[PDB]
Design a protein around this ligand. Sequence first.
Ligand SMILES: [Fe+3]
Ligand SMILES: [Fe+3]
Ligand SMILES: [Fe+3]
Ligand SMILES: [Fe+3]
Ligand SMILES: [Fe+3]
Ligand SMILES: [Fe+3]
Ligand SMILES: [Fe+3]
Ligand SMILES: [Fe+3]
Ligand SMILES: [Fe+3]
Ligand SMILES: [Fe+3]
Ligand SMILES: [Fe+3]
Ligand SMILES: [Fe+3]
Ligand SMILES: [Fe+3]
Ligand SMILES: [Fe+3]
Ligand SMILES: [Fe+3]
Ligand SMILES: [Fe+3]
Ligand SMILES: [Fe+3]
Ligand SMILES: [Fe+3]
Ligand SMILES: [Fe+3]
Ligand SMILES: [Fe+3]
Ligand SMILES: [Fe+3]
Ligand SMILES: [Fe+3]
Ligand SMILES: [Fe+3]
Ligand SMILES: [Fe+3]
Ligand SMILES: [Mg+2]
Ligand SMILES: [Mg+2]
Ligand SMILES: [Mg+2]
Ligand SMILES: [Mg+2]
Ligand SMILES: [Mg+2]
Ligand SMILES: [Mg+2]
Ligand SMILES: [Mg+2]
Ligand SMILES: [Mg+2]
Ligand SMILES: [Mg+2]
Ligand SMILES: [Mg+2]
Ligand SMILES: [Mg+2]
Ligand SMILES: [Mg+2]
Lengths: 167, 167, 168, 168, 167, 168, 167, 167, 167, 167, 167, 167
Amino acid sequence: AKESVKILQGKLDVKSLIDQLNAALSEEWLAYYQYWVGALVVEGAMRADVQGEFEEHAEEERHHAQLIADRIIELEGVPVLDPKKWFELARCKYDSPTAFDSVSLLNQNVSSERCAILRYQEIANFTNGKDYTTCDIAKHILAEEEEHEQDLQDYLTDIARMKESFL
Amino acid sequence: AKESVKILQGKLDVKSLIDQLNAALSEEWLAYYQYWVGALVVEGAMRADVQGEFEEHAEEERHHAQLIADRIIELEGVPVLDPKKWFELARCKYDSPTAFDSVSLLNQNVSSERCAILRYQEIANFTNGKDYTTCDIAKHILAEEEEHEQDLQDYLTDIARMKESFL
Amino acid sequence: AKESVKILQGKLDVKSLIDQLNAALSEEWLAYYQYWVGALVVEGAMRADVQGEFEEHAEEERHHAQLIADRIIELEGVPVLDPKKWFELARCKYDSPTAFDSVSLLNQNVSSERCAILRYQEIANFTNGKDYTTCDIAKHILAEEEEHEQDLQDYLTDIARMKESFLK
Amino acid sequence: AKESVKILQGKLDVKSLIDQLNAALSEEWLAYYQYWVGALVVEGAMRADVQGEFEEHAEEERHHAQLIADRIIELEGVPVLDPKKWFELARCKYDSPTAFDSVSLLNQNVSSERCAILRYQEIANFTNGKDYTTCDIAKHILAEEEEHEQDLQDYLTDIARMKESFLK
Amino acid sequence: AKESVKILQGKLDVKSLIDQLNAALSEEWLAYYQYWVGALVVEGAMRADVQGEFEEHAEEERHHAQLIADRIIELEGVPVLDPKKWFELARCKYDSPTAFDSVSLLNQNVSSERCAILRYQEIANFTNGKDYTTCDIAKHILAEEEEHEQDLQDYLTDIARMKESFL
Amino acid sequence: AKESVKILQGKLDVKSLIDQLNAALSEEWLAYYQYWVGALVVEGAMRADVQGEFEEHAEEERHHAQLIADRIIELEGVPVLDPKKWFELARCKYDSPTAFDSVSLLNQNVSSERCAILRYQEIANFTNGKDYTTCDIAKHILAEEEEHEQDLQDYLTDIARMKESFLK
Amino acid sequence: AKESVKILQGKLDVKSLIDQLNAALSEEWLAYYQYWVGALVVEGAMRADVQGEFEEHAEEERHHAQLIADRIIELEGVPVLDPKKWFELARCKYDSPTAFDSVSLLNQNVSSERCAILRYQEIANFTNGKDYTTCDIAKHILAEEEEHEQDLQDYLTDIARMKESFL
Amino acid sequence: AKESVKILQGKLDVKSLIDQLNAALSEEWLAYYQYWVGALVVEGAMRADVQGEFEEHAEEERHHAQLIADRIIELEGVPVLDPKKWFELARCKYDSPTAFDSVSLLNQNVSSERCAILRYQEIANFTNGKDYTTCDIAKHILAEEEEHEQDLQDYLTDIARMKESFL
Amino acid sequence: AKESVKILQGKLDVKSLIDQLNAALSEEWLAYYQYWVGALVVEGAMRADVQGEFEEHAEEERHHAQLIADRIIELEGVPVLDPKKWFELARCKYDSPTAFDSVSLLNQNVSSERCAILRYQEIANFTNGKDYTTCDIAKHILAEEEEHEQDLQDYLTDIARMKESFL
Amino acid sequence: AKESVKILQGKLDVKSLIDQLNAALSEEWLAYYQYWVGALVVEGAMRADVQGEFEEHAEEERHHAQLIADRIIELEGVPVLDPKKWFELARCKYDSPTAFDSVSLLNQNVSSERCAILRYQEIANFTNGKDYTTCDIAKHILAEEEEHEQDLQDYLTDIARMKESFL
Amino acid sequence: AKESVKILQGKLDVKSLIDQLNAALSEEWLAYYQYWVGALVVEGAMRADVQGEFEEHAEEERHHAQLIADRIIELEGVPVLDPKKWFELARCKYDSPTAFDSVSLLNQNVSSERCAILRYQEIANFTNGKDYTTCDIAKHILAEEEEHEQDLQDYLTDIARMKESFL
Amino acid sequence: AKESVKILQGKLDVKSLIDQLNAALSEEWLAYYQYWVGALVVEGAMRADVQGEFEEHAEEERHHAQLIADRIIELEGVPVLDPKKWFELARCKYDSPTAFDSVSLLNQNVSSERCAILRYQEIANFTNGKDYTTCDIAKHILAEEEEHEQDLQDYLTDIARMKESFL
Ligand SMILES: [Fe+3]
Ligand SMILES: [Fe+3]
Ligand SMILES: [Fe+3]
Ligand SMILES: [Fe+3]
Ligand SMILES: [Fe+3]
Ligand SMILES: [Fe+3]
Ligand SMILES: [Fe+3]
Ligand SMILES: [Fe+3]
Ligand SMILES: [Fe+3]
Ligand SMILES: [Fe+3]
Ligand SMILES: [Fe+3]
Ligand SMILES: [Fe+3]
Ligand SMILES: [Fe+3]
Ligand SMILES: [Fe+3]
Ligand SMILES: [Fe+3]
Ligand SMILES: [Fe+3]
Ligand SMILES: [Fe+3]
Ligand SMILES: [Fe+3]
Ligand SMILES: [Fe+3]
Ligand SMILES: [Fe+3]
Ligand SMILES: [Fe+3]
Ligand SMILES: [Fe+3]
Ligand SMILES: [Fe+3]
Ligand SMILES: [Fe+3]
Ligand SMILES: [Mg+2]
Ligand SMILES: [Mg+2]
Ligand SMILES: [Mg+2]
Ligand SMILES: [Mg+2]
Ligand SMILES: [Mg+2]
Ligand SMILES: [Mg+2]
Ligand SMILES: [Mg+2]
Ligand SMILES: [Mg+2]
Ligand SMILES: [Mg+2]
Ligand SMILES: [Mg+2]
Ligand SMILES: [Mg+2]
Ligand SMILES: [Mg+2]
């Protein structure tokens, strides 16, 4: 949106915003896949519930990706065109499943959530009072990432508590 | 409903019925909150399932409250106007969460269900063959309280059984 | 959410935020019940409409409570565990029905609303630019409380206006 | 249902039950029409709400009629085949609109309701513990008639209360 | 609708129109009940289908009644306030079930449909080009009565044809 | 639709029809806004119901506009392209809210309705037996305008009747 | 539900109630299958309608089974674990299709309905005023069995009447 | 519908009406297929939109066919029993696709719409004020044919305008 | 689909496949109309049910036609562009209604079903293991034609069985 | 479907196919009940999830039974008319619940799944390329039985993995 | 909302806010009509798509109008009561269709979107941190205006690109 | 599914099948992203339609990935756990957008479709008659890839045909 960008360029560094958004975009796709494949391999304590959350969270990150990519286009930017570039652009590094047990996978995904939380706070901070539209997108995604963290932490807490309780 | 009450006053003590209903109403609001907050804090074995039941049961007690309150109005009564009075009127005492583990919360809520079962049997007994409408309301709620008890007991049974099984 | 709270503790007093949220939570449950019982007893001018709003508003405060409680949990807090504590924590005092006429009940609920608006403006102000997520929750609830106020005021206005109109 | 009736004839006077049901059926159709035409002509205080209830109640009596008629067939009876007979069979007399104001129409329908409540209490009492199926039908209808009474009384109460309130 | 009626009074005899509509209304209620009770007692050939049509047709006549009554009100008329008057006002006489077999009931209802068809043609003729709104209502109902006739005739045709075929 | 218009030009003055439709279109947009803003400001007797009708009627006039505009396009016409022209083209004059009480607003909208009824009767008369499609559109809109009139009159009747009833 | 049963044991013989429920349960499964397979093989007069009812009734008995089994569990009982036992426990004997014509199948299913009607009247009688919850279940099922009887009898009546009519 | 036809025979030539309806019916089936196969082969400018309209219009003509055929039956007529006869009865001649480009197909279908428009105006004229029911059917179909014409003309207009614009 | 066809041309005679599909297409349109007009004129035993099936089957053949036509396009073929050609291409000959009784119409439609069955067995045989996609289409349609045959045969069986039973 | 069967009798032994289908049918009813009663009594580790699967799988086997029975009818066969015969015909023996813990019940149902898997592989092999319709039914059911096996194995895997993890 | 406004008057100039909102309201109604009539007359390149967007955007501006008007009322203001005043109050001038081609109409509407974007940024800036509720409304509308701009620009881009590509 | 795999290992090389599936899985994710980002950047002729297809096809490939991954798990395999490996495993190479015009993007996606087509023909061939379940998955995906190819080719055909037509 050329006229909108023209107006926004007066208030903040749009070019930098686009770079941050493409880093975010790369991170969303990685977090998406990480959950998706995690769902496919998770085993053990509370598996059906944890698998279910991973599936749900995969779908939520995918939607995040779309919100971000659509906004990049509105800012006259180009979203990352090649998945090979995700790894360069991402600050949050892809955390591949090795151990398939639920605690291991829950811990990996919690770290990625923390890094997601850090990204959208930055973008919200960067755009607050300047790019109202991008700011609200970041805040929306942020709220969901905090919920994701909480959801995963609850399972970790429950499994830890079960373990104690059984001794 | 003045004409209805006129007819019913010939068959039973409506004034006493209203008092019983207001004690029941008080109890429903307490049971409602108890489940609601219990859902918010429950941790441990089978948490997602137990939390889910607490949420569902919270909503079911709320609906019980409406059935009772609406009927009080039809009996030309006034429902309890102030939550401060719930504690005076209730026979079932509010059972505050202290321990957040699922067995603790399950046991507390099972106690409340037993108390609710006693209430609606009384009201059903009091109204059977006399106030058909209020009787059917009591029986309806009763059936749901018995199901609630069963639901909670099943988790207690499952967690006890897991514990054995793991040794 | 431990990592989220860790980050937020650098920007604001989360402990204080939780206390404000638990006061808000207490207030929501009281406002909820107030509307719910009000709906059950309201009589007089425009009763069906006013009763309807009370029922709708009861459900809306009920949802506010959930938004607040869920967020308390995310801030590593514990929501108020006992209704007996609502009265201590609440700044907005429960306003029990005495008169059952619609103007009386409307006026009571308008006060409760104005007090709610003040609560969420405070929380919004406290969290603005710092806890984006909690701030948006407060702003969301706030927007609804302002609508509730407007809804109730409209009935007061209409009834007052009818009264005038009928003398002539 | 021949085998079901055979069994029930050992427990109660089914022939009498059928007669009571056909009197009830007649009454439902009259109550149905009364509400339906009442809705069409009602004017004055709280008209839109009162008209709405009349329309809703018309539909609810209509459904009562079906419950009753279906059960008559199950008891090997024949439902009243001619509307001309409704008036003979009905204990509740059709209460034709004369005054179209809402209080007048509300009062007429409240009488019809009270008469309906009496009918279903009788049928419930007659069948209690004996014809479980018919009893539950009567109790179901009864619960609705009590609600109808309450709904109508509320408007009477509100209008009376408005009237007072406006003098001052 | 006072202003609408004022305009229409210049084009046709509204008072007469209202009388015709009230005769139609009376007839709809009778036809409604006739189908309703017919459905309750029908037996024999193609009973489930014939019963089903009677039920459907009952509901369709009921809706006709509402269309007519609502329009009477808009013409500043009063719809018939007492069912006792239906029999006076109706041209189509109520045709009570005596024989419960489907051919008997089908023939009775076909007669009623013929009578209904005559009514709405009259009203359509009376209002054509003058009271556009009432005319379209009459035509709408007419189309449905013609369909009702067809529906009933088809069963008569099918049962007659079965009879032949089986000899 | 060129071929359709070609055929219709043999039966009636299509150019004149289009002008009538554009006057109607202008009137719909004015009636639409009138109801829409009326809904926003109405106060007093039966306000919630009256406001509700205004909102519903606003949406119904909005749909009338679309039916008319679409048909203009089918008649190879151009709908009015500038709201500034509505006022010139409209026979029904925009009736701005001054008094916000429900009787005042009801009376204003009843006039607008009566004027709408006249418009569609004209168009129906103009097209009857000649432009079947446009005629049915006018008749459809007409039937709705008559209902709108009735709806509004009912409230006037009810409020007048309440007023009487309350003196005694 | 242990607390509920404790309360009920004071009012009636729960053990006996459970045995009656398991006999009922066995009967429901047999009635279910009987309708299900009857639907699959029915031929002749009004076949499509009769087949349709059999299909519907099969589904209704299956739901009855669930209501009964769920309540058995709530009464601290164990539902019949093995279909081989159905035949021992059932009073209503499975009535296998031999003749596939609709009258034959209708008669068989009517007899099973009669026996179903007898069962739930007994259970209703046994539990009336004592086990409100189980009583309402029995009454609910009873109402449906009476409807089933009526539905089947109507076809028998129609076919008989067709037969006459065609001579 | 025998009684309805009896009444209508007094007002117009029903036999002739039926012949006109069967010509219309034949035309609808041809127009239906023409659109259907046109959709399957269309190529070029605005293809996806034009294909979509052809698909939609095919479905609309099919519904027209049903309205007409159902009414023929109500008029005691027999609808054309054999597709071989469509070509004899149709005034609108089937216009087979030769050129598959959108302008060619749009022009062919516009001509068929014009001929459809002519048919229903005739039938409306023939039945106006006499057979209210058949008249309303013709008018309903007519309105849709005029819309079809408009829809197709719009594409022709757009493509012509694009062509200019690009030079 | 040019690349797909290129691959398929190595495995089978695509040109012949297209011809078989166009013959099938022609046959579907004829079977479609046959059922559609049959529904409009059927009379007699079990008419409502038989009419209903004809209506349902009409719709099912019409969907078959779409599956076949779409696939022809994917095989780079052209579907039959003119209904006049249906009769040349079809092996299954159009079986026009003469007698309107249900047995006559049922018998005619059964023959056409058998003919459809032969067609899709052929096409399934022709494409099995070679054109997986077209094979699955043919098998899908085949399964529905077998069901159609069964549906129709059931009515013939029922009517024959009624006839006996009534003597 | 007589004509379809006539054609199929040339390609395979239909009589044998019917016997295999009736054995499968018997097996589906047993597997259906097994899951259904298993759901009612299951206790312990992951109970809510395991109970849920048993309920879902009960419903899926019940649908399998319908697919098989319907096809038997189409092959001019008669489905097993008496549940007493299920035990004779079934290869998969009914595996009655003894121990109510989830591992025990999971193991029992896994064995029955394997047995269902064998059955549909056989029937698919028997009919492949010959009875396309029955083959696709067998393959459809097969795919679901493989999924069932996977579902159940997952829980066994999770519970085994929890056990380890807790020591 | 008197108490709300009382509070807000301490934080900002509400009177000025209301004037800005009424200017915005005026502008929304003009933008609404502009799109609405534009949709009615648009011709040429990508017409169906562009027409569709105009229709969608018309509906979106209408909704904007309601959000604004409702908020004016809550701020104890009066929304503009007469459309004649829209032109005085609006900063964005109504841009009447002259040329009906899609590029012309797209350019006109893009201008209007730019003007709308300026308005809601102003209102957002004016209310940020002070009137949270009105601010969020402005931001919400802003986000949609930026999307509208993007949507329109994409068509301009596509049509320009087509033009090049075709030479 | 251990028992299922045991049976399948007798009929084919499951280990090889898993490798082929993981290559397919990798390919689906790449084709998914390719379409997704292509939708985001496409410009020019028929953009809205082409963009829409890319969006739809993105979603369809994403579902393909799930079908394949789920089946890998059932074959006791592990799906590719890291997106970095997609590029190694994929035969179909990721075809990054360079030119954003619709013809360029359409051509790129057509090539990838052909490559998907080859893959599922291979897997269908590999598993035909041996792994019925995996074969049907491959055939299902295959049918969709053929449709995708057709969809894309249609646009190329239309745009080429427009170009000619405009000169
Ligand atoms: Fe994310
Ligand atoms: Fe996340
Ligand atoms: Fe409760
Ligand atoms: Fe409870
Ligand atoms: Fe609140
Ligand atoms: Fe509030
Ligand atoms: Fe009643
Ligand atoms: Fe009543
Ligand atoms: Fe009628
Ligand atoms: Fe009729
Ligand atoms: Fe209008
Ligand atoms: Fe109007
Ligand atoms: Fe049963
Ligand atoms: Fe039964
Ligand atoms: Fe047509
Ligand atoms: Fe057409
Ligand atoms: Fe077919
Ligand atoms: Fe077929
Ligand atoms: Fe199975
Ligand atoms: Fe299985
Ligand atoms: Fe806007
Ligand atoms: Fe905009
Ligand atoms: Fe794919
Ligand atoms: Fe693809
Ligand atoms: Mg989650
Ligand atoms: Mg529960
Ligand atoms: Mg409200
Ligand atoms: Mg009511
Ligand atoms: Mg009918
Ligand atoms: Mg209205
Ligand atoms: Mg039944
Ligand atoms: Mg169209
Ligand atoms: Mg069929
Ligand atoms: Mg499963
Ligand atoms: Mg848009
Ligand atoms: Mg596609």
